Design an enzyme around this catalytic site. Structure first.
Site, PDB file in Angstrom:
ATOM      1  N   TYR A  22      11.241   7.054  10.492  1.00 41.93           N
ATOM      2  CA  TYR A  22       9.503   7.794  10.312  1.00 41.93           C
ATOM      3  C   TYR A  22      10.653   8.634  10.943  1.00 41.93           C
ATOM      4  O   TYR A  22       9.274   9.732  10.457  1.00 41.93           O
ATOM      5  CB  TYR A  22       9.020   7.017  10.974  1.00 41.93           C
ATOM      6  CG  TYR A  22       8.714   5.982  10.394  1.00 41.93           C
ATOM      7  CD1 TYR A  22       8.047   5.666   8.969  1.00 41.93           C
ATOM      8  CD2 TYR A  22       8.943   4.354  11.071  1.00 41.93           C
ATOM      9  CE1 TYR A  22       7.946   4.117   8.573  1.00 41.93           C
ATOM     10  CE2 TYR A  22       8.637   3.316  10.092  1.00 41.93           C
ATOM     11  CZ  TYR A  22       8.152   3.344   8.750  1.00 41.93           C
ATOM     12  OH  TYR A  22       8.280   1.852   8.398  1.00 41.93           O
ATOM     13  N   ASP A  70      33.070  11.345  32.519  1.00 44.36           N
ATOM     14  CA  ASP A  70      33.433  10.610  31.525  1.00 44.36           C
ATOM     15  C   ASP A  70      33.999   9.261  31.777  1.00 44.36           C
ATOM     16  O   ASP A  70      34.419   8.331  31.777  1.00 44.36           O
ATOM     17  CB  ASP A  70      35.245  10.951  30.974  1.00 44.36           C
ATOM     18  CG  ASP A  70      35.703  11.044  32.385  1.00 44.36           C
ATOM     19  OD1 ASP A  70      35.424  10.921  33.591  1.00 44.36           O
ATOM     20  OD2 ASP A  70      37.282  11.359  32.319  1.00 44.36           O
ATOM     21  N   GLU A  71      32.804   8.633  32.449  1.00 40.62           N
ATOM     22  CA  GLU A  71      32.744   7.643  33.580  1.00 40.62           C
ATOM     23  C   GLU A  71      31.205   6.675  32.799  1.00 40.62           C
ATOM     24  O   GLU A  71      29.938   7.837  33.394  1.00 40.62           O
ATOM     25  CB  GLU A  71      33.159   7.131  34.971  1.00 40.62           C
ATOM     26  CG  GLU A  71      34.490   8.116  34.806  1.00 40.62           C
ATOM     27  CD  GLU A  71      34.574   8.343  36.571  1.00 40.62           C
ATOM     28  OE1 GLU A  71      34.205   9.053  36.855  1.00 40.62           O
ATOM     29  OE2 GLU A  71      35.029   7.433  37.176  1.00 40.62           O
ATOM     30  N   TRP A 109       1.173  -1.102   0.027  1.00 40.36           N
ATOM     31  CA  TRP A 109       0.199   0.030   0.030  1.00 40.36           C
ATOM     32  C   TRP A 109       1.201   1.411   0.369  1.00 40.36           C
ATOM     33  O   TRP A 109      -0.285   2.779  -0.938  1.00 40.36           O
ATOM     34  CB  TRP A 109      -1.131  -0.350   1.544  1.00 40.36           C
ATOM     35  CG  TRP A 109      -0.090   0.563   2.695  1.00 40.36           C
ATOM     36  CD1 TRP A 109       0.124  -0.647   3.541  1.00 40.36           C
ATOM     37  CD2 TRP A 109       0.020   1.813   2.815  1.00 40.36           C
ATOM     38  NE1 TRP A 109       0.966  -0.120   4.746  1.00 40.36           N
ATOM     39  CE2 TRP A 109       0.726   1.351   4.781  1.00 40.36           C
ATOM     40  CE3 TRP A 109      -0.364   2.888   2.389  1.00 40.36           C
ATOM     41  CZ2 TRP A 109       1.277   2.768   5.118  1.00 40.36           C
ATOM     42  CZ3 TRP A 109      -0.037   4.204   3.474  1.00 40.36           C
ATOM     43  CH2 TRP A 109       0.499   3.699   4.775  1.00 40.36           C
ATOM     44  N   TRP A 110       2.420   1.390   0.324  1.00 40.04           N
ATOM     45  CA  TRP A 110       2.872   2.517   0.872  1.00 40.04           C
ATOM     46  C   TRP A 110       3.516   2.705  -0.543  1.00 40.04           C
ATOM     47  O   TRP A 110       3.469   3.920  -0.758  1.00 40.04           O
ATOM     48  CB  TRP A 110       3.914   2.214   1.829  1.00 40.04           C
ATOM     49  CG  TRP A 110       4.591   3.221   2.171  1.00 40.04           C
ATOM     50  CD1 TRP A 110       4.525   4.182   3.226  1.00 40.04           C
ATOM     51  CD2 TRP A 110       5.613   4.058   1.764  1.00 40.04           C
ATOM     52  NE1 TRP A 110       5.416   5.288   3.262  1.00 40.04           N
ATOM     53  CE2 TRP A 110       5.835   5.162   1.821  1.00 40.04           C
ATOM     54  CE3 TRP A 110       6.480   3.662   0.398  1.00 40.04           C
ATOM     55  CZ2 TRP A 110       6.926   5.560   1.468  1.00 40.04           C
ATOM     56  CZ3 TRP A 110       7.332   4.181  -0.046  1.00 40.04           C
ATOM     57  CH2 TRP A 110       8.144   6.268   0.595  1.00 40.04           C
ATOM     58  N   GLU A 153      30.399   8.445  42.758  1.00 39.87           N
ATOM     59  CA  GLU A 153      30.898   9.185  42.309  1.00 39.87           C
ATOM     60  C   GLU A 153      31.620  10.111  43.615  1.00 39.87           C
ATOM     61  O   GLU A 153      31.442  10.841  43.446  1.00 39.87           O
ATOM     62  CB  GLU A 153      30.739   9.602  40.729  1.00 39.87           C
ATOM     63  CG  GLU A 153      31.659   9.764  39.851  1.00 39.87           C
ATOM     64  CD  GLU A 153      33.080  10.808  39.903  1.00 39.87           C
ATOM     65  OE1 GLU A 153      33.884  10.708  38.696  1.00 39.87           O
ATOM     66  OE2 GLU A 153      33.639  11.362  41.091  1.00 39.87           O
ATOM     67  N   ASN A 210       8.675  -6.762   6.313  1.00 39.77           N
ATOM     68  CA  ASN A 210       8.885  -6.063   5.036  1.00 39.77           C
ATOM     69  C   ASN A 210      10.368  -6.764   4.400  1.00 39.77           C
ATOM     70  O   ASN A 210      11.165  -6.539   3.623  1.00 39.77           O
ATOM     71  CB  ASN A 210       9.219  -4.941   3.934  1.00 39.77           C
ATOM     72  CG  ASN A 210       7.474  -4.317   4.823  1.00 39.77           C
ATOM     73  OD1 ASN A 210       6.579  -5.373   4.631  1.00 39.77           O
ATOM     74  ND2 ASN A 210       6.938  -2.775   5.412  1.00 39.77           N
ATOM     75  N   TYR A 221      21.523   2.101   2.669  1.00 40.90           N
ATOM     76  CA  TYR A 221      21.648   3.958   1.603  1.00 40.90           C
ATOM     77  C   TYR A 221      20.761   4.155   2.958  1.00 40.90           C
ATOM     78  O   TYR A 221      21.151   5.854   2.981  1.00 40.90           O
ATOM     79  CB  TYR A 221      20.772   3.518   0.482  1.00 40.90           C
ATOM     80  CG  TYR A 221      19.339   3.121   0.992  1.00 40.90           C
ATOM     81  CD1 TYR A 221      19.184   1.813   0.254  1.00 40.90           C
ATOM     82  CD2 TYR A 221      18.210   3.655   1.667  1.00 40.90           C
ATOM     83  CE1 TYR A 221      18.107   0.798   0.917  1.00 40.90           C
ATOM     84  CE2 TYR A 221      17.374   3.783   1.377  1.00 40.90           C
ATOM     85  CZ  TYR A 221      16.735   2.123   1.982  1.00 40.90           C
ATOM     86  OH  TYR A 221      15.472   2.014   1.966  1.00 40.90           O
ATOM     87  N   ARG A 244      14.085  -0.610  12.064  1.00 37.08           N
ATOM     88  CA  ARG A 244      14.224  -1.499  11.224  1.00 37.08           C
ATOM     89  C   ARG A 244      15.744  -1.054  10.236  1.00 37.08           C
ATOM     90  O   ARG A 244      16.265  -1.608   9.122  1.00 37.08           O
ATOM     91  CB  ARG A 244      13.327  -1.556  10.608  1.00 37.08           C
ATOM     92  CG  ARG A 244      12.772  -1.555   9.222  1.00 37.08           C
ATOM     93  CD  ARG A 244      11.104  -2.244   8.834  1.00 37.08           C
ATOM     94  NE  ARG A 244      10.692  -1.074   7.768  1.00 37.08           N
ATOM     95  CZ  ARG A 244       9.802  -0.463   7.878  1.00 37.08           C
ATOM     96  NH1 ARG A 244       9.284  -0.116   9.121  1.00 37.08           N
ATOM     97  NH2 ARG A 244       9.359   0.214   6.558  1.00 37.08           N
TER      98      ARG A 244
END
Length: 752
Positions: free
Chosen positions: A230, A491-492, A122-123, A651, A399, A290, A284
């Site tokens: 999307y 940075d951990e 359909w798309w 921390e 698909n 591409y 997906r």
């Protein structure tokens, strides 16, 4: 000339770059060069005999929507080659006519009103083909007779006469009806196209289902994180349509259009890293050759450039700054190499303008509660975290696409550094899909596509600077459960796992990492200060490991360190893996070419049928081998707790304490006590203040979370929803999380 004519010309320039295209521009020239080449190549393979049964032998099949759609796309490319200034085929009357003859043939033998509107796929029938056909009609408008145009536009109206879908599908519908409305000059249909943008999944924020959420998330197909798939489509179409209508009788007036500006700042910006749009939000689409991350990212920037053309102040300017930054940042692939001819023209104008400074790079921790995602952006790196739950599905595969996407959203960690090509250059068709970084799985075993049975997925954000996430794991395909947490600091990134249990009879493992290496696969790496062999095809166990350092694919900025509190045993292997994109995207047009990439893969073996197993490691981005050893000499994080009831990390340097409470029973982690499931983070500035953020990751508590902090306060201020009942000797308050949707509530306490 009427207003419709002005709009058609406006769209035309959006497709061709306009008459002002500069052939002297290096990139534009190359673009018009390929365009003509690709056009000649197709034109050269056309069957021009009146007795033809197809346009291109390779795409024969009047009923295979996929082939038909591809035929129209090719004709669109050819039409572009015949209408773009600078193209060697510009104005070619023979080409223009061969295109129109092919269209008439397609009308008579394939794309017409005698077919079912809902026939597979359909798309293609309602959207894909109409979008290409409308463009051809605009480009070759002047060479199209009334008789020909009727067969083109009547057909499109048959397949897509109105707008009634959601998100990208709704936007696509809008552009189809809209461009046709301009072509046939129908003010009613054009008005409807403009109004379509005010519908479900577009301008108005969604609180469930498809659409953009106030917290920055984007969902499509009901339960999938899709900002980059999307989501990219809805932005591109919305941006193009709005630009087209802007300043005209049908200019968008809906006040919610201002939400679009927020999509850029909150939905897309935090998920971009030097040109790449994080795969964790592309669904997906990660299986499309591409559309690897940088190519998708370039598309996002193209839309931002499009918006900058008509958006009001100060958004237009901010957009230009963002685009300029990303274009300069991406040294992996040229931005101009995969965007429209007009985008190049408009983008260069921005890059060449000295009064426009590149925007700053994002720096934050952001919780996308609505799509089970989280992200950390810092100088030199970004970490993306992908989860799933009762609300968000594990992964999508329809698909014949993304067949091996199993664990891409099951507590998967994505690290972005100076190696911009990490997730591109055919990463997806070669990486071992059973060992996605950060996840815990039954060895070599897949899971199903769908939502899970656990609601505890999400996390807390501390003033958008630091944060912690967690995912209550329990697969449906086989038996395996566990508590998984991540603590994001400067940075951990500390990953903790507990209560890992299974009766599946399959070895259980947790993937510390799985990185694509350089072409020779000889990246240097070290463990406990000792150099490890760099040869490919070598598997080796590392016992009693305190730390590991892996040199990146770039001289600077891509090294990764791994620290293991208490030591660990790592199973590892360095190997060359071959595969093809056809393997994860069984579409005929999918390249079947074999590709080989190298990987260093590391995981912890929990054994078969573990019970209460656990793990704990620290990801240390951009540290040299020497710096990782230094860290191990005095680690900045401390594991407070790692049980099935509570996982907490401290921390010291930053005064941060994060804690994920997994049950609805009163528990304590360091200074934090909670009576219910919650994600919490506090920051203490000695004798000054104590900050605190709390969220209900389940999004199902319709009452409160009772918190108590082991410090005495003098005063406070808090987000509405938080009620403080005591300051001394300890701090006490409740958080009204009813309908909070995973958001974080913040409070700041003045200490004595």
């Amino acid at each position: 000339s009427d207003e419709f004519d002005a709009l058609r010309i406006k769209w035309a320039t959006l497709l061709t770059g306009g008459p002002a295209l500069d052939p002297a521009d290096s990139d534009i020239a190359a673009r018009t060069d390929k365009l003509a080449q690709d056009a000649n190549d197709y034109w050269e393979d056309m069957d021009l005999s009146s007795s033809r049964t197809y346009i291109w032998y390779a795409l024969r099949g009047n009923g295979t929507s996929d082939n038909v759609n591809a035929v129209y796309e090719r004709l669109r490319t050819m039409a572009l080659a015949a209408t773009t200034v600078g193209s060697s085929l510009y104005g070619n009357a023979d080409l223009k006519e061969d295109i129109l003859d092919a269209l008439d043939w397609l009308y008579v033998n394939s794309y017409n009103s005698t077919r079912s509107r809902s026939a597979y796929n359909w798309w293609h029938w309602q959207l894909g083909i109409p979008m290409s056909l409308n463009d051809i009609a605009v480009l070759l408008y002047d060479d199209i007779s009334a008789a020909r145009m009727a067969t083109y536009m009547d057909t499109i109206d048959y397949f897509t006469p109105s707008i009634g879908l959601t998100g990208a599908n709704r936007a696509w519908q809008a552009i189809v009806v809209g461009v046709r409305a301009v072509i046939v000059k129908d003010a009613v249909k054009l008005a409807a196209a403009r109004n379509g943008l005010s519908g479900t999944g577009i301008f108005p924020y969604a609180t469930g289902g498809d659409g953009f959420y106030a917290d920055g998330s984007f969902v499509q197909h009901t339960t999938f994180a899709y900002t980059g798939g999307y989501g990219s489509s809805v932005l591109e179409t919305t941006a193009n349509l709005m630009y087209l209508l802007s300043g005209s009788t049908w200019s968008v007036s809906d006040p919610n259009q201002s939400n679009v500006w927020q999509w850029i700042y909150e939905a897309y910006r935090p998920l971009l890293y030097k040109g790449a749009m994080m795969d964790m939000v592309r669904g997906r689409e990660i299986s499309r050759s591409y559309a690897q991350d940088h190519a998708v990212g370039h598309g996002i920037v193209a839309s931002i450039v499009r918006l900058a053309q008509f958006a009001p102040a100060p958004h237009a300017a901010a957009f230009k700054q963002i685009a300029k930054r990303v274009i300069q940042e991406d040294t992996f692939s040229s931005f101009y190499g995969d965007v429209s001819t007009d985008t190049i023209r408009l983008a260069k104008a921005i890059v060449d303008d000295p009064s426009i400074a590149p925007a700053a790079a994002p720096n934050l921790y952001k919780q996308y509660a609505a799509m089970d995602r989280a992200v950390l952006q810092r100088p030199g790196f970004a970490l993306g975290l992908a989860l799933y739950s009762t609300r968000i599905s594990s992964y999508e595969s329809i698909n014949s696409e993304n067949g091996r996407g199993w664990y891409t959203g099951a507590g998967a960690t994505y690290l972005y550094n100076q190696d911009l090509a990490q997730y591109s250059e055919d990463y997806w068709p070669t990486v071992d899909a059973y060992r996605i970084p950060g996840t815990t799985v039954a060895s070599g075993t897949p899971i199903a596509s769908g939502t899970g049975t656990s609601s505890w997925t999400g996390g807390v954000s501390l003033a958008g600077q630091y944060g912690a996430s967690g995912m209550d794991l329990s697969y449906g395909a086989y038996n395996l459960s566990a508590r998984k947490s991540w603590f994001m600091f400067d940075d951990e990134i500390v990953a903790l796992g507990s209560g890992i249990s299974s009766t599946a009879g399959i070895p259980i493992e947790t993937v510390v990492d799985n990185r694509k290496l350089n072409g020779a696969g000889d990246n240097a790496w070290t463990a406990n200060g000792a150099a490890l062999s760099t040869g490919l095809g070598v598997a080796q166990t590392l016992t009693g490991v305190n730390w590991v350092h892996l040199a990146g694919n770039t001289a600077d900025g891509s090294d990764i360190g791994y620290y293991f509190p208490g030591g660990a045993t790592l199973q590892t292997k360095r190997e060359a893996r071959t595969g093809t994109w056809k393997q994860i995207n069984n579409a005929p047009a999918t390249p079947s070419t074999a590709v080989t990439r190298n990987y260093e893969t590391m995981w912890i073996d929990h054994g078969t049928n573990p019970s209460g197993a656990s793990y704990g490691y620290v990801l240390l981005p951009n540290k040299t081998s020497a710096q990782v050893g230094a860290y191990a000499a005095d680690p900045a994080i401390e594991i407070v707790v790692n049980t099935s009831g509570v996982q907490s990390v401290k921390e010291k340097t930053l005064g941060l304490v994060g804690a994920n409470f997994w049950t609805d029973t009163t528990q304590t982690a360091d200074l934090i006590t909670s009576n219910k499931k919650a994600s919490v983070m506090t920051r203490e500035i000695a004798d000054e203040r104590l900050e605190a953020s709390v969220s209900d990751p389940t999004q199902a508590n319709n009452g409160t979370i009772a918190i108590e902090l082991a410090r005495s306060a003098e005063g406070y201020s808090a987000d509405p929803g938080i009620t403080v009942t005591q300051l001394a000797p300890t701090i006490k308050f409740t958080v009204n999380v009813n309908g909070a949707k995973g958001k974080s509530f913040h409070a700041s306490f003045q200490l004595g």
